């Protein structure tokens, strides 16, 4: 089969610079074979660019490409909110057909401090048998944000779940959740519960505890 | 006269077959196979290996016997003119030492942490993991012992780039720190110290590699990725890229112009056979990557057997094929501690003979041409080592990975192609093969053939122009994952490139400066050897 | 006025068989020929099999091969795909994709349909609440953890509240998912007011309502 490897699968944008995009084939592809699709997040995968260069239907002019042979490029000319997406690019040539790796564009803004909150496991759990506690981290840019359990006053690492949120439409930054799993008991011989954020916004972790004597 | 000699005939070998085998024997050449074609790669390897590869390696172990003194001072009295082949040959080695010994202090980062039963890289619920984490290497995602390796290790995830290297890893400082506290006092006497340790360095790997090698073997499927290794596709005999990984993997595996087969050979006897020493340790480097590779695809095999990944995946160069993907299958496998252990430590032992050869490079080419330098030769070290781990601190941030991966690719780049490029030329028609034959014979009490002498004069310069010239057209600016190095980055390697390659003209026209005479006489004075 | 939908599609162990429906309307049917592409959850496009206008014509991409079988109804406009032999590896969401013309590539997409291939058995979730500890305004969120498969539904009071409101994607654990929602209120409201969370996770009929309470 002919591999299709596209470039950068991650790229971040300010709204009005250019960008572009470029992927690259394994195998020759005739330039009116290949194509673009746009695909919003949770929404069905739309035509975008056919035949390398001819727009489709509803996109509007900002959008371009170019390329022939084993290597094409997507460029749009200056990036509107509303064009953050993942963007896959196709080969017709030949059977099995093919697509791209895909590049996924997402919007630059100011960075922002998180807001940490921490959760003790509701007492309906512990009935269960099981402890859990939850921590949640929303409003920050940039993405990549790292959490720390410290149990006082030492760090446990395993039983730990983090799960971050796609980026928003509006603010355009990014939330995460961290949660600790434990039995009941080990949340009985223990003390209390910490989870704490190391951000670029600062050097310094934003730090929230809470003890069940309290 | 006199300058001290090795303490045994032993210990000159291992320790040249110690700085020859490296992680790169390793890392780098049972990929090649697997990539290449397999078994039919080893059709290109040898050839290139014998018009090369060996002979460049028998010349520096040649001149270094024969001139009995350092880089420096050795290429001084074989041409005075090209005396700056002595200083890029030298601080070659020197920009190397920035980033290499990074690889060790990993290595017992990875052996420190391997003290428990419940491997930390093996699971996906830790602290320090993403949604996008798996068990094992898959397409798209993350394997556990992956995001080990960058989130929890090295904190590579806290930097953007090379412009923000952010804070410091302390644990990794520490690691560092013992790393060159092993090299202090393993370099800090003479060749009578440091020529006993290889012992271990050099031959401790074999010990492990045999134990993980009947470890290999016998999992389950790993007959398959036996096939995966050697499996004859001869189609790529064709193929010119093969020819030039071929060209490239036999000309850095074993290394000329570090200056260090040049130091090493420099406290031979004058007598002795240098031209068996050669052989014999050109061989066991050779067959050390490929008894290596059995070591890898064996478990490469086992993994694409009972853990149920793609080859494609796991099969993998650099230094995410030890600290990712073989780990990952340690862990599976029963007594896994046990593996970790020797493996990290073999990893260890692997990338220290390396270093003493580099840093001994250094120090003998300064003890020769300073004399005050072999005075108080610890002050020079400790002051050496210390501005080593002064900067070595720069490897140990978050974006520690960002600066060793730069330097890489461009101190020991192209600087060292052309640097050994005009080290054949300067010996085969400057100096003249038949000076360095007549040289050869007093010693071994023969000539060497015919085949010898026309490869140093012809086949090597192309040899070499050869791989420089299609290193070239293969030229990308340099790139790790998505991210993409600044052109400011790649701006500032090319002067660490050119800082040696710069020695060549320079000390070359400032010597014809000091010179009396025309053009005419002063160019004969300078290529006149020091036996004159 | 082109519509594609897909039916069919759901949790199968593996070696199993499944069939999958495609409903077509807003262009004639049998003058276009259509294509099964399915996309894994790495986000990552794969296509599996097309069929010509007349159905005359089959081409398999394959991982695929004599495992599954493309069929076409041009009378009910209706386009199937039959499976066999189902692996993990298999697991995607399947889109029923229109082209006729190569050149222009694939101009028109369904919403897709789900399908999960696994050994795991499925379970309920169980839902906890979260309470603050003893502001200008406050955070509440909703613990759903230990079920299979996806998808569930989480919303807050009755699916009113939008704003504030960051719902945390699942996670795979040992055959598990756990998944968690944050929605910020002022301290105005509560506990001015009754917060309410609520999950449905319709495979294993369990619909759950859970009530706040500071205590
Ligand atoms: C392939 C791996 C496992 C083993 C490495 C093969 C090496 C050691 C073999 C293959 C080809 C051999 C060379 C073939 C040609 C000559 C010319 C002869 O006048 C001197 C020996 C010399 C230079 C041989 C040295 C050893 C040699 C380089
Ligand atoms: C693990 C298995 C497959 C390979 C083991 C390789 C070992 C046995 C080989 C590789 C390199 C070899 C050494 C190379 C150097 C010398 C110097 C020589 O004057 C005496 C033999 C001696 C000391 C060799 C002994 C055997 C040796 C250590
Ligand atoms: O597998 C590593 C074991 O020790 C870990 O602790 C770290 C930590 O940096 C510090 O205690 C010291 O440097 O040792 C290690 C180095 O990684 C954790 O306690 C666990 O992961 C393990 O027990
Ligand atoms: C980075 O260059 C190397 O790794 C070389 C060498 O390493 C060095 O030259 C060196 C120099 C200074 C410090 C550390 C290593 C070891 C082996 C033999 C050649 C090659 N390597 C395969
Ligand atoms: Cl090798
Ligand atoms: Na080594
Ligand atoms: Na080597």
């Known amino acids: 089969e002919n591999v299709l490897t596209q470039s950068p699968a991650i790229m971040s944008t300010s709204p009005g610079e250019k960008v572009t995009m470029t992927c690259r084939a394994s195998?020759?592809?005739?330039?009116?074979?290949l194509h673009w699709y746009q695909q919003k997040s949770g929404a069905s995968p739309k035509l975008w660019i056919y035949s390398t260069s001819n727009l489709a239907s509803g996109v509007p002019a900002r959008f371009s490409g170019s390329g022939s042979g084993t290597s094409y490029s997507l460029t749009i000319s200056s990036v509107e909110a509303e064009d953050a997406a993942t963007y896959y690019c196709?080969?017709?040539?030949?059977?099995?057909?093919?697509f791209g790796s895909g590049t996924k564009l997402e919007m630059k803004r100011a960075d922002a401090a998180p807001t940490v909150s921490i959760f003790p496991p509701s007492s309906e759990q512990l009935t269960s048998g099981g402890a859990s506690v939850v921590c949640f981290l929303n409003n920050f840019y940039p993405k990549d944000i790292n959490v720390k359990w410290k149990i006082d006053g030492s760090e446990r690492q395993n039983g730990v779940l983090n799960s971050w949120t796609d980026q928003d439409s509006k603010d355009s930054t990014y939330s995460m959740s961290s949660t600790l799993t434990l039995t009941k008991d080990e949340y009985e011989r223990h003390n209390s519960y910490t989870c704490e954020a190391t951000h670029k916004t600062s050097t310094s972790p934003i730090v929230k505890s809470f003890n069940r004597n309290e | 006269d006199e300058r001290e000699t090795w303490s045994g005939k032993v210990d000159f070998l291992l320790s040249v077959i110690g700085f020859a085998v490296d992680l790169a024997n390793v890392w780098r050449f049972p990929y090649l196979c697997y990539k290449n074609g397999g078994g039919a790669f080893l059709v290109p390897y040898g050839i290139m290996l014998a018009v090369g590869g060996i002979p460049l390696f028998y010349m520096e172990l040649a001149l270094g016997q024969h001139n009995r003194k350092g880089a420096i001072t050795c290429w001084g009295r074989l041409v005075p003119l090209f005396k700056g082949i002595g200083y890029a040959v030298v601080l070659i080695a020197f920009y190397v030492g920035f980033y290499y010994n990074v690889i060790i202090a990993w290595s017992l980062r990875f052996f420190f942490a391997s003290f428990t039963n419940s491997l930390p890289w093996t699971s996906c619920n830790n602290i320090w993991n993403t949604p996008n984490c798996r068990p094992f290497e898959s397409q798209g995602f993350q394997s556990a012992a992956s995001e080990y390796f960058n989130r929890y290790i090295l904190e590579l995830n806290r930097s953007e780039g090379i412009h923000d290297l952010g804070a410091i890893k302390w644990d990794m400082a520490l690691c560092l720190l013992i790393v060159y506290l092993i090299c202090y006092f393993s370099l800090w006497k003479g060749i009578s110290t440091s020529g006993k340790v290889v012992w271990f360095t050099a031959l401790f790997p074999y010990a492990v590699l045999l134990i993980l090698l009947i470890r290999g073997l016998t999992l389950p499927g790993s007959f398959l990725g036996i096939q995966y290794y050697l499996t004859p596709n001869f189609s790529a005999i064709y193929k010119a890229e093969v020819w030039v990984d071929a060209a490239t993997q036999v000309f850095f595996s074993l290394g000329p112009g570090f200056g260090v087969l040049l130091a090493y050979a420099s406290y031979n006897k004058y007598h002795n056979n240098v031209y068996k020493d050669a052989l014999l340790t050109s061989f066991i480097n050779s067959a050390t990557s490929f008894i290596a590779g059995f070591v890898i695809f064996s478990v490469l095999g086992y993994m694409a057997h009972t853990l149920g990944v793609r080859i494609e995946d796991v099969a993998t160069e650099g230094p995410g094929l030890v600290f990712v993907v073989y780990p990952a299958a340690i862990a599976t496998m029963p007594a896994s501690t046990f593996w970790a252990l020797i493996f990290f430590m073999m990893l260890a032992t692997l990338g220290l003979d390396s270093s003493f050869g580099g840093m001994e490079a250094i120090i003998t080419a300064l003890s020769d041409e300073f004399p005050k330098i072999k005075r108080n030769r610890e002050l020079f070290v400790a002051g050496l080592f210390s501005l080593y781990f002064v900067v070595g601190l720069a490897s140990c941030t978050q974006g520690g990975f960002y600066f060793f991966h730069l330097l890489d690719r461009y101190a020991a780049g192209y600087s060292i192609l052309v640097a050994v490029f005009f080290e054949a030329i300067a010996v085969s028609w400057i100096y003249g093969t038949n000076r360095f034959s007549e040289d050869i014979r007093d010693m071994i009490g023969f000539p060497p053939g015919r085949y010898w002498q026309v490869c140093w004069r012809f086949v090597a310069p192309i040899f070499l122009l050869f791989i420089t010239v299609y290193g070239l057209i293969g030229y990308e600016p340099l790139t790790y994952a998505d991210y993409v190095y600044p052109s400011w980055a790649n701006a500032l390697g090319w002067c660490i490139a050119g800082s040696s390659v710069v020695m060549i003209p320079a000390v070359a026209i400032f010597k014809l400066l000091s010179t009396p005479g025309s053009l005419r006489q002063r160019f004969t004075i300078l290529t006149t050897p020091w036996r004159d | 006025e082109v519509q594609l939908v897909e039916s069919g599609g759901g949790l199968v162990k593996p070696g199993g068989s499944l069939k999958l429906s495609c409903a077509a309307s807003?262009?004639?049917?049998?003058?276009?020929?259509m294509s099964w592409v399915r996309q894994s959850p790495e986000k990552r496009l794969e296509w599996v099999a097309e069929?010509?206008?007349?159905?005359?014509?089959?081409y398999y991409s394959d991982t695929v091969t004599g495992r599954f079988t493309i069929s076409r109804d041009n009378a009910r406009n209706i386009l199937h795909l039959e499976m066999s032999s189902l692996r993990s590896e298999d697991t995607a969401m399947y889109y029923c994709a229109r082209g006729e013309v190569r050149q222009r590539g694939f101009d028109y997409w369904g919403q897709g349909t789900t399908l999960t291939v696994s050994s795991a058995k499925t379970t309920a979730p169980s839902v906890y609440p979260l309470a603050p500890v003893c502001g200008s305004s406050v955070t509440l969120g909703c613990l759903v953890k230990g079920y299979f498969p996806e998808p569930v539904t989480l919303t807050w009071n009755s699916g009113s509240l939008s704003s504030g409101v960051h719902t945390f994607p699942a996670v795979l654990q040992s055959d598990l998912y756990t998944l968690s929602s944050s929605v910020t209120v002022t301290s105005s409201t509560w506990p001015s007011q009754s917060i309410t969370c609520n999950v449905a996770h319709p495979a294993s009929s369990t619909k759950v309502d859970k009530k706040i309470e500071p205590r």
């Open positions: 195998s020759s592809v005739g330039s009116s074979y």
């Open positions: 069929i010509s206008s007349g159905g005359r014509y089959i």
């Open positions: 807003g262009f004639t049917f049998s003058s276009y020929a």
């Open positions: 196709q080969q017709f040539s030949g059977y099995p057909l093919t």
